[PDB]
């Protein structure tokens, strides 16, 4: 069981995307092109996503976070979880939320974290600092 | 975790069908068009199906129940579980039978409950009173 | 399942039994009502014997259906029509008949290619109304892996 | 075999294992080395899980054959070549490896149409001489009659 | 009831065959052209087959034993029972395994014992020393 | 602090080489292209090297092991530590032997493990199964 800290950078005020955890998690090559190449099964036990807000106080908007444990949803949809663009905050997601109770093979993803900024301008918003706890088993 | 009680009504003596639990479970809109719209992950922990038998004593036949956790079987096939049309009874199904050990997303079904009455006439048989226990996860 | 063989219990059902249904339930490799024995464990053993069977009539019928379905054991595996009328389930009642080893030719092993016995049944009813179903519980013993 | 399901133990063998043999033993409905599971009891149940397996290498080889056959679990049911070389039986020695439920994806039931895991093996030997055989002892649990 | 001890000789490292017990059991003429000519009914109660392993330690392989009480199987098929070519061992088979519960006429066989060596070379493997217990009935 | 198990494979009877622990430790990408990309400082606390001996009994020779905490020695030199090619064995090396008392940066190696088989033929000898215990510091 290890802990990885990585960052989603250059996050504008109209940035939308998906952070696809697993072997397609290119923002942390220590997991993607790293330790998942040396194990069969893994599970991500909990993640702690932090918005750091490198923005001016006049930028309006709130970036939205939504968990997709189907690994297929493209557009966001839900607007309950939100970081305000002008404030640092952090959201912590446990195992049953992120499909983290059972191991799965290192070839398939576990969940996606979709985000949508929903601001008007392309001004800078900040970055995510994501701290995930993975468990591994059956070396390869 | 909450408990829903719904009914499958107007059940004739030759009625066959599938009660598709999950988002396509139209017999309980409090789950289908309801609380599953406000959560990502769910599991149905146990169901208690009851046959109520609003039938005369001269109606012959026995309605058959079969669990499909593949969510694809159309015709019934198995004839072990059965309610007699002229008698009230109840069958209780736990978690490992109904694929209820793990959470899954609110977009996909969990299991189906197929039923086939296998009587001759179109006379009234009764109704199902189904009591399901669901557990909900990450909100949406 | 040890390779020398084992003893297990199968529960299967003969379904959709009308009030004029007649037939034979041919136990062994031609016992299509339990594929776990027919297309199943008999493909993985040479010799078998069915030690005892417990046939149950479940009677999914109305009280106005007259008749009585008759049961007859054929350990020759060749009789087509019924003939004997001693053993009977009433169509409107649940009952069960249990048959031990010497009745069903179940004392000795035989190869998994040949049947052991047949269970003939004949409804003896006028209408094609529903009668019920059989729930059959057989105890098999297996010998020599294949 | 209750219609709600049961737990049984199957013993089968992977035979004629040379000193350069590689392959995959695909557990589930495609597990042709045990027809009692493949064309057998999985035809009479919806859901199953293989709780634990005990693979044994029996080493019908001379003492001059060099090499070590390698074992690797694939619970994705898609890996073709071996890759990992940690688990190994020496070709000239009898041994056994036992794999529990969380290693072989054996915690949850799944439908009898899909496989559960594969066991890949690769001899890692020069010649085509005889190495031995696997004697595999798996414990399955069954759920929902079909 | 008497006991016969006979031998299957000159057993190479790729030898396969069937030892057909009964009147066609040519490896023991005391049963084949012997006491079965003087009785109608017989049964072989138990057999004890022994592999004696007149082989060098460098011969690889294992000869396989399989009982055929149908008296028709030609190729081997099963690989559970085995003698290692470089070791002496013995397997004992009781009555229900070898179809030895009931008498049968002296004109028909009772069972076959198939063996297949499954080694590469034609080097010497050993011999079988088989000890069978027969029971005889009505004289002839 | 985590434990890595990796293997040095395809080890012939005349194989010589160096297993260079640290960022150049290509036999375990979970350390090399893995967790060392996500931390500044590391130390390998102890290693347990095991020779597994996939060899025939007629292969002569003994593979030799020598620790180089200078990370510069090319040829072997010392012949005290040895695995016999025809036997499984294991050698365990603690912290002061492998330069494992102090942290160092993830860009530089810690020690090398040189091995030289010193047999005549190119026949198969076996493999190493190496179990190392690393400690990680400041994240990166």
Author numbering:
A (entry chain A), B (entry chain B), E (entry chain B), F (entry chain B): 61 to 200
C (entry chain C), D (entry chain C): 55 to 200
In the authors' words:
The Luteoviridae are an important family of pathogenic viruses responsible for necrosis of the plant vasculature which, in turn, causes severe stunting and dwarfism, and ultimately crop loss. The structures for BYDV and PLRV each reveal a luteovirid capsid composed of 180 CP monomers. The CP monomers each contain a single canonical jellyroll fold, and are arranged with T = 3 icosahedral quasi-symmetry to give a particle with a diameter of ∼30 nm. The luteovirid capsids are formed from CP subunits with a canonical jellyroll fold comprising two opposing β sheets, each containing 4 antiparallel β strands (βB-βI).
We therefore present high-resolution structures for VLPs of BYDV and PLRV at 3.0-Å and 3.4-Å resolution, respectively. BYDV and PLRV CPs assembled into monodisperse, homogeneous particles of the anticipated diameter. When imaged in ice, both BYDV and PLRV VLPs were monodisperse, so cryo-EM datasets were collected for each (see STAR Methods). Structure refinement was carried out with icosahedral symmetry imposed, yielding density maps at a resolution of 3.0 Å for BYDV and 3.4 Å for PLRV. Density maps for each structure were of sufficient quality and resolution to allow for unambiguous building of the shell (S) domain of the CP (BYDV: residues 61–200∗; PLRV: residues 68–208). In both cases the N-terminal R (RNA-binding) domain is not resolved in the cryo-EM density, except in the “C” conformer of BYDV, where an additional six residues of the R domain (residues 55–60) are visible. No density for such metal ions is seen in either BYDV or PLRV, and no putative metal binding sites were identified using bioinformatics. As for many viruses, both capsid structures are strongly positively charged on their inner surfaces, presumably to help facilitate packaging of the polyanionic RNA genome. The outer surface charge profile is similar in both BYDV and PLRV capsid structures, with an acidic patch at the center of each asymmetric trimer. Inspection of the interfaces between individual CP protomers, and between asymmetric units, in BYDV and PLRV suggest that both viruses have a similar volume of solvent hidden surface involved in supramolecular assembly. BYDV and PLRV have comparatively short insertions at the C-D, E-F, and G-H loops, where larger insertions are found in all other viruses with known structures, resulting in a much more compact fold.
